């Protein structure tokens, strides 16, 4: 009961991280996008291994 607020957030985040992209109301399944935090780690691990 007093951890039920944490039960709800993991229900949201599991639906949030498994989010689908909608274009015209209908989903485009088979659509791959790369985030600006995913691509900022590709920059940061490449700026790290060149600085090394």
């Amino acid at each position: 009961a007093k951890n039920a607020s944490e039960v709800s957030e993991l229900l949201a985040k599991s639906l949030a991280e498994k989010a689908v992209v909608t274009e015209g109301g209908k989903v485009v399944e088979g659509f791959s996008y790369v985030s600006k935090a995913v691509a900022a780690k590709v920059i940061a691990t490449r700026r790290a291994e060149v600085h090394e």
Binding site: A48, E49, H51, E52
Partner: protein, 49 residues
């Protein structure tokens, strides 16, 4: 005995960025020339006698 620059080049290349500056005095002293130690005396050799 291979040369010590290829020992410096190799032992820097196979070192991660976290333990790099910790390990430089290891590579500095592993590629030092040998200056052999002042041994025990054994004075007045066969030809010296």
């Amino acid at each position: 005995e291979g040369n010590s620059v290829a020992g410096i080049i190799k032992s820097v290349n196979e070192t991660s960025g976290a333990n790099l500056l910790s390990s430089l005095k290891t590579i500095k002293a592993q590629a030092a020339p040998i200056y052999p130690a002042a041994a025990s005396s054994t004075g007045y050799s066969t030809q010296a006698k």
